[PDB]
Amino acid sequence: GSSGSSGLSNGQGSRVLHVVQTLYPFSSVTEEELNFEKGETMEVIEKPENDPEWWKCKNARGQVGLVPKNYVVVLSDGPALHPAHSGPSSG
Numbered sequence: 001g002s003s004g005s006s007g008l009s010n011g012q013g014s015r016v017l018h019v020v021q022t023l024y025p026f027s028s029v030t031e032e033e034l035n036f037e038k039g040e041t042m043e044v045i046e047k048p049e050n051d052p053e054w055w056k057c058k059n060a061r062g063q064v065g066l067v068p069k070n071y072v073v074v075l076s077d078g079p080a081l082h083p084a085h086s087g088p089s090s091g
Contacts, residue, residue, distance in 0.1 A: 016079045017044035020057065020072040034065035042072070043079075 025038040034057060036042070042057040045064060054066040076084065 012045075014045040014056075017047070018074050018078070019043055019076050020055075020069075020074050022067075022072050024071050026068065026071050028065070031063070032066055034059055034063070034067040035061075036067075042067070044074075 020042055022036050022038065022040040027035050036059050040059065042059055044055055044057050046056040048054055048056060053069065055069050056064055057067050058064045
């Protein structure tokens with residue numbers, strides 16, 4: 001079963017607002033909600049007004065949905081836009 005790819009792309013009015021990480025694993029059944037695991041990196045594409053407790057992000061699967069902010073956390077602001085290194089974290 002050979003696999004292949006053409007190169008489909010979309011055009012939405014949104015960009016990488018802020019990079020957030022998932023502290024706890026949250027998996028939904030519907031498409032509305034996002035699906036990820038513990039220790040997943042995403043990017044805030046849009047934030048809903050009506051539901052401020054929820055944020056719009058895109059997982060690795062390239063799918064967007066409503067993810068609970070109380071579960072994620074903002075690490076940096078912008079895709080390597082501001083001058084800031086990971087940290088003195090021991091290697």
